[PDB]
Design a protein around this ligand. Structure first.
Ligand SMILES: Cc1c(O)nc(CC(=O)O)c(C)c1OP(=O)(O)OC[C@H]1O[C@@H](n2cnc3c(=O)[nH]c(N)nc32)[C@H](O)[C@@H]1O
Ligand SMILES: Cc1c(O)nc(CC(=O)S)c(C)c1OP(=O)(O)OC[C@H]1O[C@@H](n2cnc3c(=O)[nH]c(N)nc32)[C@H](O)[C@@H]1O
Lengths: 169, 169
């Protein structure tokens, strides 16, 4: 017997998907994305616990923490280390999978966004859900970065809850 | 040759010390704790890079991510767990040393608060700094949690800038 455990390794989303899931689970009355959760969602959230929520903007950093090897970035300059959308998808997956092996949680989440719509991977005991944000942006030129970040957090949380209710309840 | 690298493993401060250092280093024009940074600090900040800021509210979680062993909690109700001051201070220091060993960063930060004033350790290449927050709170009764969290963030960042200046500049 245990709780439904979750951990996250996030880049463009700033650990906000895992921080939000934690505040919801911990019964906070106020938090930025609380409007995403119904009354019933918040009840179910009482059964959830965040084990870690990590902001990981370093390739070497996350490789050392999660024992994983990431692909070479498509843009490799230092006001511009960035993956294309295809490798962002691959990276969100390798991080989710590495976290799940590191921490043995029920649900792990990876997020990364370079050039394109970015990538979130939610991996559970049952299935893997991989998706982009709805917002094209460009880390190297700074176009639409803010809007992509916000949409990534909202979509990641929205999908997390659908998945949680589907598989665990 | 290298930048000044920083990593953090934060519990009560919610990874906000690391996220705030990152936003400053990244030249964000505003962000919640910007008022702690002088215009000269902000210039110095461009030579700093955050490798990871992690929120780690699980003992097993931080033990697995940092490869350390933590002391038994002083209050352990399975779902609720807290240290008092002496073990909080030990644990901040264990996390900071663990982070420095794992990631080889110049500056590592650990934070944890159970019952009492909580504990922040800032570990550099040259020195170790260990201090409590200024606010007594109690995880178990919930008294003064919010006030201690904000004070821990402000005091960590303030002491961080002082140390960065004194040692790296
Ligand atoms: C704020 C805080 C703390 O003081 N100590 C620790 C342990 C450590 O640092 O060693 C953690 C993890 C922490 O962060 P957390 O968000 O877990 O707050 C701890 C608990 O404190 C309660 N709590 C915190 N903020 C709120 C809030 O806004 N509303 C409610 N209802 N409970 C809250 C919740 O039960 C929550 O589980
Ligand atoms: C937003 C974002 C993103 O789209 N992609 C990545 C790589 C990962 O996915 S991790 C990351 C790490 C990411 O987070 P950040 O490093 O906080 O933001 C990327 C860059 O966008 C810039 N930026 C974001 N907000 C501001 C801002 O408010 N002011 C300025 N001057 N720059 C900003 C800043 O230069 C920052 O380095």
């Amino acid at each position: 017997s245990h709780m439904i455990t979750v951990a996250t390794a996030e880049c463009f989303t700033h650990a906000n998907i895992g921080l939000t899931i934690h505040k919801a689970a911990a019964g906070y009355e106020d938090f930025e994305f609380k409007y995403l959760f119904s009354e019933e969602d918040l009840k179910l959230m009482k059964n959830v616990r965040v084990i870690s929520a990590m902001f990981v903007p370093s390739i070497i950093g996350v490789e050392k923490l999660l024992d994983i090897k990431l692909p070479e970035p498509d843009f490799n300059y230092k006001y511009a280390k960035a993956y294309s959308e295809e490798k962002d998808l691959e990276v969100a997956k390798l991080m989710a999978e590495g976290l799940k092996k590191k921490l043995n949680v029920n649900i792990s989440i990876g997020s990364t966004a370079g050039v394109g719509r970015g990538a979130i991977c939610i991996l559970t005991d049952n299935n893997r859900y991989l998706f982009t944000s709805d917002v094209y942006a460009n880390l190297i030129t700074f176009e639409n970065i803010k809007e992509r970040q916000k949409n990534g957090i909202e979509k990641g949380i929205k999908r997390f809850l659908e998945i949680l209710k589907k598989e665990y309840f």
